[PDB]
Design a protein around this ligand. Structure first.
Ligand SMILES: *[C@@H]1O[C@H](CO)[C@@H](O[C@@H]2O[C@H](CO)[C@@H](O)[C@H](O[C@@H]3O[C@H](CO)[C@@H](O)[C@H](O)[C@@H]3O)[C@H]2NC(C)=O)[C@H](O)[C@H]1NC(C)=O
Ligand SMILES: *[C@@H]1O[C@H](CO)[C@@H](O[C@@H]2O[C@H](CO)[C@@H](O[C@@H]3O[C@H](CO)[C@@H](O)[C@H](O)[C@@H]3O)[C@H](O)[C@H]2NC(C)=O)[C@H](O)[C@H]1NC(C)=O
Ligand SMILES: *[C@@H]1O[C@H](CO)[C@@H](O[C@@H]2O[C@H](CO)[C@@H](O[C@@H]3O[C@H](CO)[C@@H](O)[C@H](O)[C@@H]3O)[C@H](O)[C@H]2NC(C)=O)[C@H](O)[C@H]1NC(C)=O
Ligand SMILES: *[C@@H]1O[C@H](CO)[C@@H](O[C@@H]2O[C@H](CO)[C@@H](O[C@@H]3O[C@H](CO)[C@@H](O)[C@H](O)[C@@H]3O)[C@H](O)[C@H]2NC(C)=O)[C@H](O)[C@H]1NC(C)=O
Ligand SMILES: *[C@@H]1O[C@H](CO)[C@@H](O[C@@H]2O[C@H](CO)[C@@H](O)[C@H](O)[C@H]2NC(C)=O)[C@H](O)[C@H]1NC(C)=O
Ligand code: FE
Ligand code: FE
Lengths: 348, 348
C-alpha cells in the first residue's frame, strides 16, 4: 500500500503511464481500461488508486464514494504572487465553436445539425450543451436533436457514434479514449475543423492552442482564428476573443479522484511526483515530463502548469458546485447509467 | 429513466409543458401530438408516460391497457374539511346550454338544429348527449341528427366539422386541440356565444366561469348568465342556477392515465408536483402554477384544487362506473374509432 496504482484510459495513456512508473522508482504503478467508467470501477474494486478526470466523470466517481484530491491549474492572469500549488483555481469556459464559413448557424438553429463532442458525460463536450438543449426543448430526446454527432461512449450503432471515425484502421469506433480520432477536447475540434460536424463543444483553451500555428499537427497548423466563430446563448455570433460573453457556462477544472482512505497518501505522492516530473521539475525535460504528451493531452491536460490543493476537504458536490451538480442531475433524469445504478445501492 | 414524459395535445398545451419541465428540473418532460388519441398511442409505445384525459378518452386508453393514476378534484360544498387529495371525487354535470333569446328550442326540438360539442368521444360534448339521442331516435344516424355541428375530432370533410372555425388563419379546422376556436369546454361555449351554434354540450361549471366577467377573454368578458338557459330531458328550460335539476348526466372527473408499469412513479412525481406548483404550491405563481393556463384548461382544468388519490389500483371500468361504460359501449356500436378497433383484442 506504499505505491499509487494510476489508472490509464487507452494504450497511448498506457505507454505515457509506464514511462512515469519506470522513472518514479515504482513510487507510481499503472493499471489500464478501455473507458474512464471502467477505470473508476477499478479504483472502487481497489485494483487502482487514482486518476485525473473531467468534472462530469468526477460526478460519476463522486456518486460511487470517491473524493477529489488535487485540481489541474493553468496559466493565470491574476494573483501571480501565490505559488502554482497555492494559487486558487479559475475554471475553464465551455463554449460552442462553429466555422465562420457556416452562415445562419446560431444557438436557435442547432436542431437537426451535426455535432462534435469531447465525449458522453464530459462537462464541456456533453453535460453543459445537452443539459441546456434538453432544458430549453423540455425533451429528454437529446439522442434525436443533432441529425448526426460524434460522442465517444454513446451506443456505437446510434447516430451519436455515426460521425466518429475510430483509429487509423477505423476499428473500435466511438471508444472514449485517445484511440478515437475525434476523442477528447482536441478530437471534437479536429471534427469541426475537418468539417465532419457543423458545431463542436469544447473549452476556449482548445481554440487558441490549435489555431494560428500554435499546433504542429497536420490538421491544426494552417488553421486561422477568423475562420471560427462562437455561438452565445443570446443567439448572437461573436469572435473567439469575446469568450467571456460567448461561453455556455463556467466548468470546474479537471481533478484527481481516489478512495476516501487513500486520498492524503496520493495527495503527498503526487505533490512530490510533480516537483520531480512537473512543468518545473528536476527531471523535465531531462528524464520524464508528466504534463506533456504530444497534443494527445494524455493522463493530464498539456495546458496544466501544476496540480493544486483544495481549501478544506471538499465533497465531489462542493468542488463541482451546487449549480453544476444540479445541471448534471437534471440531464441524468433522461438516461440510465449502469455504473451510477450499481454505486447507488452498492456504496449507499 | 426517472423523468416523467407528459403528453401535450397541441402547441398551447406543449408551451405550458416545456415550462413545467424547466421549473420541475426535468422531473417532467414533453411529448406533443395534434390529437389526444395520438397522445394515447405515444403512451402505449413508451414515447410519453402519462397525460390528463376526459372520461371518454379514459375508455379509449382503458381499452388499450392504460390505467388511471389520479383524478382531478374540485372545490366541494359537502365535507369541506378533508385534505383535497383524500376528499372523494364529487363528479360533475353534463348540461345542454342554449341562448334564452332562441324560442321554442327544447330537448325535443333539437332535431335538425346546429350543435357545439367539446370534441368527439368526450363525455359532456359527445358520449352522453349523442348516447341518449340515439337511444331516443332508435336510429344510429347521429351523423345526420344536427343540420351542421362543430365536433372537433370528427371527419373534417363532414357536417360535424362544418361549424369548426380553426386557428387564427382558419387552418387545422376541427383538429381536437385548443388551436381550434371551439375545441374543449371553453370552445363549445364561445361557439354558442357567437351564435355559430344553437346548443352547446358542456359541463355545469363552464357557464359560470365565462359569464359575469369571471373571464377577461374578449369573447367572454361581456357575457351575461341571464342570456343562457339549460335544456332538460323533461323537455323544459331553466336558468344556470337550476343545473342540479336541468343536467343531462353525472360525468366522472378528468384523470391522469399511464401504462401499468409506470403508474406508481407518475403518481409519486405528480403528488410532489402539485405540492410545489399546485393551488397552494410554494412556487405558485412565484415560478409556475400547474392548474392555471388562461381559462384555456391546458393539460389540466383550471377549476382543479388538486389531483386526488383513488381507491386501490382501479380499472377504467371501476373509475368510470359500470353505468357510464355501458352507455359509451352502446353509442360505440353505432360507429367505430381506429384505436378501439386496433386494441379490442386486449380488453376481450
Ligand atoms: C340506452 O343507453 C343506456 C345508457 O345510456 C343503456 O343502459 C344499459 O343498457 C343495458 C342493456 O344492454 C342494461 O342491461 C343496463 O342496465 C342494467 O344494469 C344492472 C345493474 O343494476 C345490470 O345487472 C343489468 O344486467 C343491466 O345491464 C343499462 N345501464 C343502466 C345503467 O341502466 C341502454 O342499453 C340503452 N337503451 C336503448 C334502447 O338504446
Ligand atoms: C481561453 O483560453 C486561452 C488559451 O489558454 C486564454 O489565453 C491565454 O492567456 C494567458 C494569460 O492570462 C497568456 O499567458 C501570458 O504569458 C506571459 C509570459 O509568457 C505573461 O507574462 C503574461 O502576463 C500572460 O500571462 C497565454 O499566453 C494565453 N495563451 C495563448 C496561447 O494565447 C484565454 O484567456 C481564454 N479566454 C478567456 C476569456 O478566459
Ligand atoms: C424533482 O426531483 C425530486 C423528485 O423526487 C425532488 O427531490 C426530493 O425532494 C424531497 C423534498 O420533499 C427531498 O428531501 C426530503 O426531505 C423530507 C424532510 O423534510 C423527508 O421526509 C424526505 O424523505 C426527503 O428526505 C428528497 O430527498 C429529494 N429526493 C432526491 C433524490 O433528491 C425534487 O424536489 C423535484 N424538484 C422539482 C423542482 O420538481
Ligand atoms: C355549478 O357550477 C358552479 C361553478 O362551478 C358551482 O358554483 C360554486 O358553488 C360552490 C359551492 O359548492 C362555491 O364554493 C364556495 O366558495 C366560497 C367562496 O367563494 C366558500 O366560502 C364556500 O364555503 C364554498 O366552498 C363556488 O364559489 C361556486 N363557484 C362559482 C365560480 O360560482 C356550483 O356548485 C355548480 N352547481 C351544481 C348544481 O353542482
Ligand atoms: C432552463 O431554461 C429556463 C429558461 O428558459 C430556466 O428557468 C428560468 O431561470 C430563472 C433564473 O433561475 C428563473 O427564475 C425563471 O423562473 C426561469 N424562467 C422560465 C421562463 O421558466 C432554467 O434555469 C434553465 N435550466 C438550467 C439548468 O439552466
Ligand atoms: Fe473538461
Ligand atoms: Fe369532460
Amino acid at each position: 500500500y506504499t505505491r499509487v496504482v494510476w489508472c490509464a484510459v487507452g494504450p497511448e495513456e498506457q505507454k505515457k503511464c509506464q514511462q512515469w512508473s519506470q522513472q518514479s522508482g515504482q513510487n507510481v504503478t499503472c493499471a489500464t481500461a478501455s473507458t474512464t467508467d471502467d477505470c473508476i470501477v477499478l479504483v472502487l474494486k481497489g485494483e487502482a488508486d487514482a486518476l485525473n478526470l473531467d468534472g462530469g466523470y468526477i460526478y460519476t466517481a463522486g456518486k460511487c464514494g470517491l473524493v477529489p484530491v488535487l485540481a489541474e491549474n493553468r496559466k493565470s492572469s491574476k494573483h501571480s504572487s501565490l505559488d502554482c500549488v497555492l494559487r486558487p483555481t479559475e475554471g475553464y469556459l465551455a463554449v460552442a465553436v462553429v466555422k465562420k464559413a457556416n452562415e445562419g448557424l446560431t444557438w436557435n438553429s442547432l436542431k437537426d445539425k451535426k455535432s462534435c463532442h469531447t465525449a458522453v458525460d464530459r462537462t464541456a463536450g456533453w453535460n453543459i450543451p445537452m443539459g441546456l438543449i434538453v432544458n430549453q426543448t423540455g425533451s429528454c430526446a437529446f439522442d434525436e436533436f443533432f441529425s448526426q454527432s460524434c460522442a465517444p461512449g454513446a451506443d456505437p450503432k446510434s447516430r451519436l457514434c455515426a460521425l466518429c471515425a475510430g483509429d487509423d484502421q477505423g476499428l473500435d469506433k466511438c471508444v472514449p479514449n485517445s484511440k478515437e480520432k475525434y476523442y477528447g477536447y482536441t478530437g471534437a475540434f479536429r471534427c469541426l475543423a475537418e468539417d465532419v460536424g457543423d458545431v463542436a463543444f469544447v473549452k476556449n483553451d482548445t481554440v487558441w492552442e490549435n489555431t494560428n500555428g500554435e499546433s504542429t499537427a497536420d490538421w491544426a497548423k494552417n488553421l486561422k482564428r477568423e475562420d471560427f466563430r462562437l455561438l452565445c446563448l443570446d443567439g448572437t455570433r461573436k469572435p473567439v476573443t469575446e469568450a467571456q460573453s460567448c461561453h455556455l457556462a463556467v466548468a470546474p477544472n479537471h481533478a484527481v479522484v481516489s478512495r476516501s482512505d487513500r486520498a492524503a497518501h496520493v495527495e503527498q505522492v503526487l505533490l512530490h511526483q510533480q516537483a520531480l516530473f512537473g512543468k518545473n521539475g528536476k527531471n523535465c525535460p531531462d528524464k520524464f515530463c508528466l504534463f506533456k504528451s504530444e497534443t494527445k493531452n494524455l493522463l493530464f491536460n498539456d495546458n496544466t502548469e501544476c496540480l493544486a490543493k483544495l481549501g478544506g476537504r471538499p465533497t465531489y458536490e462542493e468542488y463541482l458546485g451546487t449549480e453544476y451538480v444540479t445541471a448534471i442531475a437534471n440531464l441524468k433524469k433522461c438516461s440510465t447509467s449502469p455504473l451510477l445504478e450499481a454505486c447507488a445501492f452498492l456504496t449507499r
